[PDB]
């Protein structure tokens, strides 16, 4: 509906850093 992608850590849904989407 309102789409984002974000560079983050401990996030969707992984132990590490990287690029997280939708």
């Amino acid at each position, epitope marked *: *509906h309102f*789409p984002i992608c974000i560079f983050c850590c401990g996030c969707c849904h992984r132990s590490k*850093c*990287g*690029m997280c989407c*939708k």
Partner: antibody
Amino acid sequence: QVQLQQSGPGLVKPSQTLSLTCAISGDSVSSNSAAWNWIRQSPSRGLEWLGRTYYRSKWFNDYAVSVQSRITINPDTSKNQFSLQLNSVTPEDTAVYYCARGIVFSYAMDVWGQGTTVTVSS
Amino acid sequence: NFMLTQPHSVSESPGKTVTISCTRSSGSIASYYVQWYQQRPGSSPTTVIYEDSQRPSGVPDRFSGSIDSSSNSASLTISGLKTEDEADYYCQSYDSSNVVFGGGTKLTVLG
């Protein structure tokens, strides 16, 4: 199996625009689980990631800082392809250019295209 | 603005186990995923390990990735070396601002 077919001029004069296309088959350019990347390789600069395009309810494109001011990566859903342009080329842009499928999160490449040599020379 | 550093070449007899390391200049090796790419001469690269140790469909189980958050270095290990494994291998990662490849390692399988 995913296939990536590369196409475009192999010689480009300095100051002109390099322009390549990668035609995808066996997978979707709008695929919800893929990213579509451009990577170049020279002896002396080695492997260099250029940028990437992907659809997550919306097209997103990431780009290497070194080339962001001269680069365009565009999808085409009507042809199931993505392109690469690089403006204002210099002989430092001579390289083999690969298109590749990869993983959004981990900046990973999945499936590599066969590559195209582009030479910049007047 | 980090770098990833690998030995220029590494060589080992067929049947044996070999490791190729990749040291990260700055940033934590463990915080970002590490890919390994194989490239035979005159061919496009092929992914052999992704997300630190995931092995893509078709890659022999002789190939494995590992991480050493201590020495700040990823590693690609190949066991029971066969002459087909002779290639350049590149590690690759990222941080928040850039994607980085290692400089590559020529693996020779001593014949």
